[PDB]
Design an enzyme around this catalytic site. Structure first.
Site, PDB file in Angstrom:
ATOM      1  N   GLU A  35     -42.503  50.068  51.591  1.00  0.00           N
ATOM      2  CA  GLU A  35     -41.216  50.658  52.079  1.00  0.00           C
ATOM      3  C   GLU A  35     -41.054  52.066  51.525  1.00  0.00           C
ATOM      4  O   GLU A  35     -40.610  52.916  52.270  1.00  0.00           O
ATOM      5  CB  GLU A  35     -40.070  49.770  51.663  1.00  0.00           C
ATOM      6  CG  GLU A  35     -39.977  48.448  52.336  1.00  0.00           C
ATOM      7  CD  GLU A  35     -39.537  48.530  53.813  1.00  0.00           C
ATOM      8  OE1 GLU A  35     -39.232  49.652  54.324  1.00  0.00           O
ATOM      9  OE2 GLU A  35     -39.711  47.528  54.574  1.00  0.00           O
ATOM     10  N   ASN A  46     -33.308  56.357  60.997  1.00  0.00           N
ATOM     11  CA  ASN A  46     -33.696  55.483  62.120  1.00  0.00           C
ATOM     12  C   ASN A  46     -33.146  56.087  63.438  1.00  0.00           C
ATOM     13  O   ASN A  46     -32.233  56.840  63.434  1.00  0.00           O
ATOM     14  CB  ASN A  46     -33.124  54.079  61.939  1.00  0.00           C
ATOM     15  CG  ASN A  46     -33.460  53.467  60.580  1.00  0.00           C
ATOM     16  OD1 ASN A  46     -32.586  53.033  59.773  1.00  0.00           O
ATOM     17  ND2 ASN A  46     -34.661  53.381  60.356  1.00  0.00           N
ATOM     18  N   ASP A  48     -31.340  54.734  65.697  1.00  0.00           N
ATOM     19  CA  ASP A  48     -29.911  54.408  65.937  1.00  0.00           C
ATOM     20  C   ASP A  48     -28.973  55.297  65.181  1.00  0.00           C
ATOM     21  O   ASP A  48     -27.787  55.171  65.354  1.00  0.00           O
ATOM     22  CB  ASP A  48     -29.606  52.906  65.749  1.00  0.00           C
ATOM     23  CG  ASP A  48     -29.759  52.437  64.310  1.00  0.00           C
ATOM     24  OD1 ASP A  48     -30.092  53.256  63.450  1.00  0.00           O
ATOM     25  OD2 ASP A  48     -29.600  51.257  64.035  1.00  0.00           O
ATOM     26  N   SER A  50     -28.740  55.270  61.804  1.00  0.00           N
ATOM     27  CA  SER A  50     -28.578  54.712  60.478  1.00  0.00           C
ATOM     28  C   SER A  50     -29.729  55.343  59.654  1.00  0.00           C
ATOM     29  O   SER A  50     -30.637  55.951  60.126  1.00  0.00           O
ATOM     30  CB  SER A  50     -28.688  53.200  60.525  1.00  0.00           C
ATOM     31  OG  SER A  50     -29.985  52.779  60.924  1.00  0.00           O
ATOM     32  N   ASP A  52     -32.259  54.513  56.038  1.00  0.00           N
ATOM     33  CA  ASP A  52     -32.723  53.611  54.970  1.00  0.00           C
ATOM     34  C   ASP A  52     -32.847  54.302  53.626  1.00  0.00           C
ATOM     35  O   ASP A  52     -33.309  55.443  53.568  1.00  0.00           O
ATOM     36  CB  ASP A  52     -34.085  53.048  55.352  1.00  0.00           C
ATOM     37  CG  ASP A  52     -34.062  52.262  56.640  1.00  0.00           C
ATOM     38  OD1 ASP A  52     -33.104  51.678  57.058  1.00  0.00           O
ATOM     39  OD2 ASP A  52     -35.125  52.031  57.148  1.00  0.00           O
ATOM     40  N   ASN A  59     -30.671  49.494  54.625  1.00  0.00           N
ATOM     41  CA  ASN A  59     -30.125  50.222  55.785  1.00  0.00           C
ATOM     42  C   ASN A  59     -28.623  50.357  55.861  1.00  0.00           C
ATOM     43  O   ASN A  59     -27.894  49.429  55.527  1.00  0.00           O
ATOM     44  CB  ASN A  59     -30.651  49.505  57.050  1.00  0.00           C
ATOM     45  CG  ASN A  59     -30.196  50.152  58.300  1.00  0.00           C
ATOM     46  OD1 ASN A  59     -29.177  49.756  58.861  1.00  0.00           O
ATOM     47  ND2 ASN A  59     -30.894  51.152  58.713  1.00  0.00           N
ATOM     48  N   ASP A 101     -29.457  36.065  53.568  1.00  0.00           N
ATOM     49  CA  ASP A 101     -28.658  36.147  54.809  1.00  0.00           C
ATOM     50  C   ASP A 101     -29.119  35.192  55.910  1.00  0.00           C
ATOM     51  O   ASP A 101     -28.401  35.015  56.914  1.00  0.00           O
ATOM     52  CB  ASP A 101     -28.688  37.581  55.366  1.00  0.00           C
ATOM     53  CG  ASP A 101     -27.395  37.986  56.106  1.00  0.00           C
ATOM     54  OD1 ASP A 101     -26.297  37.609  55.669  1.00  0.00           O
ATOM     55  OD2 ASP A 101     -27.501  38.742  57.088  1.00  0.00           O
TER      56      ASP A 101
END
Ligand SMILES: [Cl-]
Ligand SMILES: [Cl-]
Ligand SMILES: [Cl-]
Length: 129
Positions: A35, A46, A48, A50, A52, A59, A101
């Site tokens: 990562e 990203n 969209d 957003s 990271d 994110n 989650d």
């Protein structure tokens, strides 16, 4: 901060990630390597809109507030800039909520594509833990 491999393994062990929800330490080290290349200051935007953040590339659509991701949640209750610290505490604590989650470590694309199903114990070999 750019961690060494064993230095980060030790930091993650101290913060309770070893076997957290059944994921052995080498899974977490492998995810951090692919990562962020073990750099706490890593950021990536990203498509969209957003971004990271940090060593585990957490994110802003869901997990932290960066003031620029409209309509997003802040489930870890933290500014995203906290995730860039040399102290990995905030990252680790948010990661525990993510992995709990429902999708486990599949939330981390690099883990799914580069670590899952590989000999992840290799990432902690030679370390003093
Ligand atoms: Cl392991
Ligand atoms: Cl957010
Ligand atoms: Cl799981």
């Amino acid at each position: 901060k750019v961690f060494g491999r064993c230095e980060l393994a030790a930091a993650m062990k101290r913060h309770g990630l070893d076997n957290y929800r059944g994921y052995s330490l080498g899974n977490w080290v492998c995810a951090a390597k692919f990562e962020s290349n073990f750099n706490t200051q890593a950021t990536n935007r990203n498509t969209d809109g957003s971004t990271d953040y940090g060593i585990l590339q957490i994110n802003s659509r869901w997990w932290c507030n960066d003031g620029r991701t409209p309509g997003s949640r802040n489930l870890c209750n933290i500014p995203c800039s906290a995730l860039l610290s040399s102290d990995i505490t905030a990252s680790v604590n948010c990661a525990k909520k993510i992995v709990s989650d429902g999708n486990g470590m599949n939330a981390w694309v690099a883990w799914r594509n580069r670590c899952k199903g590989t000999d992840v114990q290799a990432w902690i070999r030679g370390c003093r833990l």
